[PDB]
Design a protein around this ligand. Structure first.
Ligand SMILES: Cc1ncc(COP(=O)(O)O)c(CN)c1O
Ligand SMILES: Cc1ncc(COP(=O)(O)O)c(CN)c1O
Lengths: 415, 415
């Protein structure tokens, strides 16, 4: 009654509980979706230049983005997407990917609109939809029939997905690479989505914040580069998962002017400007990578290699303690199946109707010194029952952290 | 129909037209609401430390604010307000003042709620209200009966204001010091507001971004420090008008936990984190001013003095060319009456029903080389008729700019 009704149902963050519990224990924190090592020098220095350079960089820049930034964005991405991008009609700099999604949702979703959300989903898609009046409609990625599983096996059933589409569908949220699962969507997959999107006349909000984090030579493809798609796609990116600098909270949406004009309205009536210097830092950082694009010394070459090693490493460590990793094709993350623990250990302490994985994560923090994340926080509540056996790990960590993980794991193992 | 209805009516920015026109002319730009000189060294350096220091400052900080920042905020402001402030329940770091208002509105205002907006208003109060479903209800500050006018004479009529209050009033937006007028609200004024707010049970969203910019020894008072008010006040501030670094876009709301918990919900479903380093810069900057609070070398002492000089200077320059300045008690701004021009020059070129001051500003850009802002952009459309004779100037400028103004003014004067 004092609060607006749009807040109904979206006030609880299941995250918190656990950060609170992790901090009152000695832990290796693998629930954190960000590096614990420095960003690349070129990028840190880029920031250092922006705050040490032309003094007017401390004052306001342009509303829809700091032009050196929109410039490089439209160029580098226009090339990557295969698309002509006007910085002033097709690019909006936002407060991180979070900002971009929020802007997108507040633009497009209205009382009654349905949004198709693919499980597992980055958790904020559902609240944002709900805050905007929309109705989330869920479809589950479904793992197909080795012990080690693979992200690319998780399947978007063409009949199931076609069925979610109604006359009320405003948008489908497609996040690739997927967090938490790590799925990198295939071309044939994308096309499935593009095709139903094209058919029912529906916007594809597409969150590609993890674009650069790809492994095993799977290749990131943007639905926006598919024939006919640019006219109905909003592509989101984030400097923070680009340059391993999450704290910079700089993101953008790329999209056709007739959609963007609304994302702009929300922007000009919400935050109006993004801060200047960080934008400057990002613009420089992109210039550096575009200059060296594909080159061996380029960050987008070295980094995915480095983190693949981290992935591989974590995958082996966790494997031998009973956890059942699903190899990810990209993202900061891997999930592991814990169903073996559920059979061996069915009755762990927690609330009635609390999903197993949350109970399990809480256990492991207390006793084994390791933080992970209950995958069920990325499912519709109706679906947490059936999907209460995964946990999510972040392998974008320092060697010293992977060592500590190993220590924790070896100590646990004697059991 | 593709866009959400909340965007109805809020898509047009009357600002733009003029920036476009100013850039295709040789101008002294006094429509810009920000310095064109560097921030204080301590503050620029503070940023330089934050991006050059502990590398993990590049990663995510806490959701509701970077603790060194919420810490210093709660301390410095708790002292200034006379109030006990818990950083974690009473402070939210937002993306500038703009962010804070947006968060406040999306928290509290809902289909049907009325918001009382005092004219002239910072323009974004009306769209934000409208986007949230609310109904703006306007009351006009009204200048009381020398040639030079004064901001403090503009009056909030106690009967007029009491009359705006209905059972549907959710909030009243109080902005002091006022932009554009420069009014610094008096204690007796505040109390009027507090008292009706207290009576009808209504939140006072109070925008004090200009807190530090006060002149002639008028004193900034926060409605939040009035008896009984903290329980129904949200106070907004902005690092950018604090440290003359608008481009940093760091703001905050201070307020009682039972309100803030909703501002938090919006925050955690919109931007989630504010960027770390800038927060760090601000936290340091405040530490520096709090240490030297009231001291002669403190920025909050030196700066208002400096800008008072700039004010005084501009007031005299514009005075002698026929403009009729209203001395401001604070803010970055002064408005001048242009009714003499309207009598001398009634028929200037523009759209039918375009207010005089907009037509006039456009004229002055083209012919006299000076940018200002039509005050009518800060009135309800119904009220722009009667209030089409002011323009707004920003005197927070370098000497070299005030010189250029003078050049433009002297050249004009020969006429
Ligand atoms: C899938 C996904 N999309 C969007 C975001 C938004 O993050 P940020 O605002 O820091 O860019 C995140 C969180 N990093 C994410 O993992
Ligand atoms: C009255 C008023 N309030 C709030 C704001 C918001 O500005 P910012 O977001 O940069 O803090 C402004 C613009 N400076 C303003 O003048």
């Amino acid at each position: 009654q004092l609060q607006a009704r749009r807040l109904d149902g979206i006030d609880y963050n299941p995250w918190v509980e656990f950060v609170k519990l992790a901090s009152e224990h000695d832990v290796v924190n693998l629930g954190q979706g960000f590096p614990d090592f420095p960003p690349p020098d070129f990028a840190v220095e880029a920031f250092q230049h922006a705050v040490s350079g032309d003094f007017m960089l401390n004052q306001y820049t342009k509303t829809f983005g700091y032009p050196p930034l929109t410039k490089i964005l439209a160029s580098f991405f226009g090339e990557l997407l295969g698309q002509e991008i006007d910085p002033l009609r097709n690019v909006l700099v936002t407060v991180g990917g979070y900002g971009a999604l929020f802007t997108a949702f507040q633009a497009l979703v209205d009382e009654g609109d349905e949004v198709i959300i693919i499980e597992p989903f980055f958790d904020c898609y559902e609240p944002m939809t709900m805050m905007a009046g929309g109705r989330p409609v869920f479809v589950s990625l479904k793992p197909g029939p080795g012990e080690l599983g693979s992200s690319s096996n998780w399947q978007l059933d063409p009949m199931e997905l076609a069925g979610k589409f109604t006359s009320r569908t405003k948008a489908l949220v497609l996040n690739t690479p997927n967090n938490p699962l790590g799925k990198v969507f295939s071309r044939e997959e994308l096309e499935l989505v593009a095709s139903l999107c094209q058919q029912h006349d529906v916007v594809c909000i597409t969150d590609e914040v993890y674009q650069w984090m790809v492994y095993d030579g799977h290749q990131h493809i943007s639905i926006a580069s598919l024939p006919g798609m640019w006219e109905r796609t909003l592509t989101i990116g984030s400097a923070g998962k680009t340059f391993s600098a999450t704290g910079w909270k700089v993101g953008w949406v790329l999209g056709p002017d007739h959609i963007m004009k609304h994302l702009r309205t929300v922007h000009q009536n919400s935050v109006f400007h993004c801060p200047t210097q960080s934008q400057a830092a990002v613009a420089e950082s992109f210039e550096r990578e575009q200059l060296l694009f594909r080159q061996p010394s380029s960050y987008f070459v070295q980094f995915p290699q480095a983190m693949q090693r981290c992935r591989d490493h974590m995958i082996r460590s966790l494997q031998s303690v009973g956890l059942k990793p699903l190899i990810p094709q990209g993202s900061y993350f891997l999930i592991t199946d814990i169903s073996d623990f559920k059979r061996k250990m069915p009755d762990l302490p927690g609330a009635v109707d609390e999903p197993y994985d949350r109970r399990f994560v809480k256990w492991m923090i207390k006793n084994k010194g390791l933080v992970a994340i209950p995958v069920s926080i990325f499912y519709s509540v109706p679906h947490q029952k059936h999907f209460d056996h995964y946990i999510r790990f972040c392998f974008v960590k320092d060697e010293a952290t992977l060592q500590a993980m190993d220590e924790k794991l070896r100590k646990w193992k004697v059991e």
